[PDB]
Structure formats: structure tokens, C-alpha cells
Amino acid sequence: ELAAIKEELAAIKXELAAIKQELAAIKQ
Amino acid sequence: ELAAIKEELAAIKXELAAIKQELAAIKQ
Amino acid sequence: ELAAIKEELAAIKXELAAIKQELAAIKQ
Amino acid sequence: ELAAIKEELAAIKXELAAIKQELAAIKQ
Numbered sequence: 001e002l003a004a005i006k007e008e009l010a011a012i013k014x015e016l017a018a019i020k021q022e023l024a025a026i027k028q
Numbered sequence: 029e030l031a032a033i034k035e036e037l038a039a040i041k042x043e044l045a046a047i048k049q050e051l052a053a054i055k056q
Numbered sequence: 057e058l059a060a061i062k063e064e065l066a067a068i069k070x071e072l073a074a075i076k077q078e079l080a081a082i083k084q
Numbered sequence: 085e086l087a088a089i090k091e092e093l094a095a096i097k098x099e100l101a102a103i104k105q106e107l108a109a110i111k112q
């Protein structure tokens with residue numbers, strides 16, 4: 001169960017990093 | 029409990045994926 | 057630790073709901 | 085492990101809080 005939680009957390013970071021790129025590319 | 033946390037994280041992940049795609053649609 | 061984890065989750069739901077409220081206003 | 089997960093969730097919460105503020109700035 002713990003490994004499956006860390007997998008979900010890793011994918012959330014990916015989404016967060018991708019959302020940050022969209023915000024950093026709208027701003028400029 | 030860990031399995032329930034996993035499901036909630038998976039829903040948060042899908043939440044961020046929809047948020048990311050909407051920002052892409054707004055910007056384009 | 058388990059109760060504090062659920063506290064952090066509930067706060068994530070709040071931010072997610074506020075983010076979608078910002079997205080709906082930007083989309084419109 | 086649970087204490088580290090709480091840190092990860094607290095950091096994700098702070099990421100979403102910053103995203104919310106950036107979206108508010110974009111909306112204005």
C-alpha cells in the first residue's frame with residue numbers, strides 16, 4: 001500500500017510541474 | 029487507511045490533469 | 057501522523073476547489 | 085514513512101496555494 005501511495009505522489013508532482021510550466025509560459 | 033489515501037491521491041491526480049488541460053485550452 | 061495526513065489532504069481539496077473557481081472565471 | 089508523506093502532502097498543498105495565487109494574478 002505504501003509503494004502505491006508513493007507512486008500516486010510522484011504522478012501528482014509531474015502534474016504540478018506541468019501546471020507550473022503552463023503558468024510560467026502564460027506569464028513571461 | 030493507506031488504500032483509502034491512495035484513492036484520494038489518485039483523484040487529486042486526475043483533478044490536476046483536468047486543471048492542466050484547461051489551462052492549455054485557455055492559453056491556445 | 058495519520059490524522060495529520062488527512063488534514064493535509066482536506067487542505068489540498070480546498071486549494072483544488074479554489075483553483076477550479078479561478079479557472080472558471082478565467083475561462084469565462 | 086508516514087511523516088515523510090505528510091511533508092510531501094504539505095509541500096503539494098503549498099504548490100497548489102502558489103498556483104491559486106498565480107491564477108488570481110492571471111485573472112486580474
Ligand SMILES: [Cu+2]
Pocket residue numbers: 001031
Ligand atoms: Cu490494497
Ligand SMILES: [Cu+2]
Pocket residue numbers: none
Ligand atoms: Cu499565505
